[PDB]
Write a protein that binds this ligand. Structure first.
Ligand SMILES: [Zn+2]
Ligand SMILES: [Zn+2]
Ligand SMILES: [Zn+2]
Ligand SMILES: [Zn+2]
Ligand SMILES: [Zn+2]
Ligand SMILES: [Zn+2]
Ligand SMILES: [Zn+2]
Ligand SMILES: [Zn+2]
Ligand SMILES: [Zn+2]
Ligand SMILES: [Zn+2]
Ligand SMILES: [Zn+2]
Ligand SMILES: [Zn+2]
Ligand SMILES: [Zn+2]
Ligand SMILES: [Zn+2]
Ligand SMILES: [Zn+2]
Ligand SMILES: [Zn+2]
Ligand SMILES: [Zn+2]
Lengths: 457, 450
């Protein structure tokens, strides 16, 4: 039961102390990294650094290529609709390329390919390989195979296929009217293609209702997941829900109903699009295990499956090394704790080094209350200023003496000098509070704030 | 095939670039931000290179202060790395090297081995630089990319920049050997695969010429005393340190006679001048033919040492092959175009359509229409309708169809079903909104569709 976290896959829109608390307490096996983290490279890198020290994870993204692209590291792709028009070998080569890059950064799973068919009702629009089930199957197969050669495990979505509905699951619960024989022949054809091969893959469920077949959304449907996916399609691998908070589910089922149906239906990992919802869902699952509404056997089998995927990963590559370099290259003098809860005035060079300067205020705001942000001229130095606490981000202190005394005329009792370019300048601030970063990069500045609040005090 | 002695920088990709590459066959391609900052051009360039022989493909992505590949996560840089266990430098460079190799690069112009005097350098201690320098070369290589250490013989002792003047380092040879040269020496002795780039720097206590042009520094020191048998590159020859003190012909002569192998040009348009200059000097005897052959031999080894299956230009092929067009009248295409572009991530793709169009067509005006309405009526010599959501209703479908059918081309860039709604019309289907697709649709319009 120190293992129940293995049944959860959590999305992270931020990386902070709550994130760390949630991860350390519940130990989710899956981590999905959202744009909130990816768009701030310093946070992504520090997050990857953290994950490498806290056990083993499935780490994933939504980088499908085309319309859904979230990793700036992967060159941009026209997408599945365009790929569908072309020799499927190109899809395989793209996904190997994307996967290899992903695997180098520290990802070990991707939520792709999309295997949903394109219909005229649907529009989603560019994310499908095509209408022809055969075209979708061969591209889907090349995609799963490419991702896998590249070093990342694919997750095909969304079972059993929901291109035949006009409705979006983020808004309401959609409906697909097709008969089972039609689903089988068509929407399920590319899924069948993958299950018949030897590629390791996960499967994500659709929050979609199929009334000619069952009353429940596929995510919550024992018929679709046990009798169709496990038994007729013979899939023994990992089954993920789409995000449970999505309206299609949350506006029609309780948290406790969703967790029950999905695990009883045969699913293995509950996807939450918000790591902060984990304690509610986690506790909900724990209840249902103790009051008997969830067969214990299903939870154990699920745990077994995740453990197989976790041990498969094996990788050497983690981009978080960058965060360690930044952390370890920071030298600081001794700082008084009692200063640090005050409101800070930032002195930042005026303005690639220029974009690094522009980002210093945003990074500081994560760690300190900020009263003003002042952009000085490096060849003049800072106007005289006062405050409760002052941060001088020193660049080129030594050009002349009228600049070195702009910097030294600041109240030494409540100024911290951040020497971020030429670390020789640190000799010119004796008795002063000094941080040397050896870098202008946002991650270094970031790690300098962490040392300031932690190790240096 | 003298092109094997040239390494060319490209700030753009166009037909001149294609002409120059096909005529002269340079062995080396260096890709500058002018191409990298436009991913559609970068991708198309890579696709072109995979079809025109073997190349050494490199960038200046050092990490830290000098970063040019958005695909590689950003690194604090060498000064920060120097403070740290050198294994981390090795890991960084493997990571960067692997990403680079996946994109299609096979060489990086890094690490910097120059010493720090009073961010691109690992430190002041020659020993620290050597250990990080070795890890970096090893990591790059492990990652799939050949490293190139720079700049021999080390020029951290000068404040002056070679982009401005010819700088001077006054240290004696005994001091260079003991200090600046030590990390270069540790690397040759460890026998890690690497290339070497020369410095456009004068060392007056040792010799009169800049190292790039100095037989003493390159032959007697680098080749003989340091025993480096590998690939030797110039820094860029057009740089003022060389160009304002030597003629093209003096620079080409000295460098090859000095023992250098590949001439780095920072501009591919200069290749013919330098190429003919090298051809001349070989014909009148100012260049020993033996040296040219030895240089060619070395280049040939690196070209085959480099393989790879990986080229990100496949993306450009997908975009190319997914384009459907009706037949187009050649003589509309020399006209001035009005663009109708959906207003404003599919929004960032739309913003970029005008920049892409301007490469292929004269553009008179750019109108940003509302796609819930469709285009206001408009007229011009030639009209490009970048159709989005044509079928919402009949008042949108008839805003698009009220445009003059003799001189409008409809680019169906999102929902390819809409194409049925434009019978008799000129229609291009891209199956994508991405700049590389839009770009490839213009090439097809000017080529295969007409
Ligand atoms: Zn789907
Ligand atoms: Zn949606
Ligand atoms: Zn049908
Ligand atoms: Zn989705
Ligand atoms: Zn609990
Ligand atoms: Zn049991
Ligand atoms: Zn650490
Ligand atoms: Zn520290
Ligand atoms: Zn230091
Ligand atoms: Zn240098
Ligand atoms: Zn320079
Ligand atoms: Zn010395
Ligand atoms: Zn240089
Ligand atoms: Zn001969
Ligand atoms: Zn082609
Ligand atoms: Zn074509
Ligand atoms: Zn089509």
């Amino acid at each position: 039961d120190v293992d129940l976290g293995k049944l959860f896959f959590c999305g992270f829109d931020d990386f902070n102390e709550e994130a760390r608390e949630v991860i350390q307490k519940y130990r989710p096996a899956g981590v999905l990294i959202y744009p909130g983290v990816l768009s701030k490279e310093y946070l992504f890198l520090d997050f990857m650094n953290f994950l490498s020290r806290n056990g083993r994870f499935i780490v994933s993204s939504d980088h499908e290529g085309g319309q859904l692209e979230v990793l700036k590291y992967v060159p941009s792709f026209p997408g599945n609709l365009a790929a569908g028009k072309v020799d499927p070998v190109f899809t395989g080569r793209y996904c190997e390329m994307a996967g290899r890059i992903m695997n180098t950064l520290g990802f070990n799973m991707v939520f792709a390919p999309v295997l949903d068919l394109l219909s005229e009702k649907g529009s989603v629009d560019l994310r499908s390989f095509g209408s022809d089930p055969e075209v979708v199957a061969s591209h889907g197969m090349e995609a799963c195979m490419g991702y896998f050669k590249g070093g990342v495990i694919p997750c095909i979505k969304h079972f059993p296929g929901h291109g035949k509905t006009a409705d979006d699951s983020h808004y309401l619960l959609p409906t697909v009217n097709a008969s089972f024989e039609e689903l089988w022949r068509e929407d399920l054809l590319p899924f069948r293609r993958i299950f018949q091969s030897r590629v390791k893959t996960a499967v994500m469920t659709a929050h979609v209702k199929y009334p000619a077949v069952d009353d429940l959304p596929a995510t919550l449907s024992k018929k679709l997941i046990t009798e169709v996916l496990r038994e007729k399609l013979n899939f023994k691998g990992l089954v993920l829900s789409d995000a449970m908070e999505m309206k299609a589910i949350s506006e029609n089922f309780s948290v406790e109903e969703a967790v029950r149906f999905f695990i009883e239906a045969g699913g293995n990992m509950i996807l939450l699009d918000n790591f902060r919802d984990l304690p509610v869902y986690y506790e909900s699952l724990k209840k249902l295990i103790e009051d008997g509404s969830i067969e214990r056997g299903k939870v154990e089998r699920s745990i077994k499956i995740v453990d197989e995927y976790l041990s498969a990963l094996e990788n050497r590559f983690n981009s978080g090394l960058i965060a360690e370099v930044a952390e370890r290259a920071i030298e600081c003098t001794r700082m008084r704790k009692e200063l640090l809860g005050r409101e800070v005035v930032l002195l930042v060079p005026s303005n690639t080094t220029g974009d690094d300067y522009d980002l210093i205020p945003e990074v500081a705001k994560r760690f300190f209350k900020v009263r003003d942000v002042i952009r000085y001229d490096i060849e003049a130095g800072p106007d005289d200023v006062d405050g409760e606490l002052i941060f001088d981000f020193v660049v080129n202190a030594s050009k002349n003496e009228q600049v070195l005394q702009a910097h030294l005329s600041l109240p030494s009792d409540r100024t911290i000098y951040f020497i971020i370019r030429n670390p020789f300048d640190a000799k010119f601030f004796p008795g002063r509070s000094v941080v040397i970063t050896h870098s202008t990069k946002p991650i270094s500045v970031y790690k300098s704030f962490q040392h300031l609040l932690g190790r240096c005090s």
